[PDB]
């Protein structure tokens, strides 16, 4: 009993990242979804979960120390519905998973030798 908010589940961008973004999503939405699924279509702000997604914003807010120099990513968090409190901890859980991790492996096995 709990559908989506429709608020701001905008998919596609240009219609050409989203396929880079829908890989992505519907891989992480879907090994999520072993642990914390959703009502249908899970999806906060304007999907941010793509390696080359997330990457983009913060390079474009000119990288994670700015974001933080000017306490925003406790808001744009929310924007993808990456850090929203203490929900922090069961989405960067999930997020962690092997399931999860494994999937976005294949796109780039490469980081995984890199180690934690």
């Not at 974001?67 to 924007?79: E, I, L, P």
């Amino acid at each position: 009993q709990s559908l989506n908010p429709a608020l701001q589940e905008k998919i596609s961008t240009e219609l050409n990242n989203k396929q880079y973004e829908l890989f992505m999503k519907s891989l992480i939405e879907n090994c999520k979804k072993r642990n914390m699924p959703l009502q249908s279509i899970p999806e906060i702000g304007n999907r941010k979960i793509n390696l080359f997604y997330l990457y983009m914003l913060v390079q474009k807010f000119g990288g994670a120390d700015q974001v933080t120099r000017t306490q925003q990513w406790s808001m744009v968090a929310q924007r993808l519905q990456i850090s929203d409190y203490q929900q922090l901890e069961s989405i960067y859980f999930r997020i962690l998973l092997p399931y999860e991790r494994h999937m976005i492996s294949q796109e780039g096995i490469k980081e995984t030798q890199a180690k934690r």
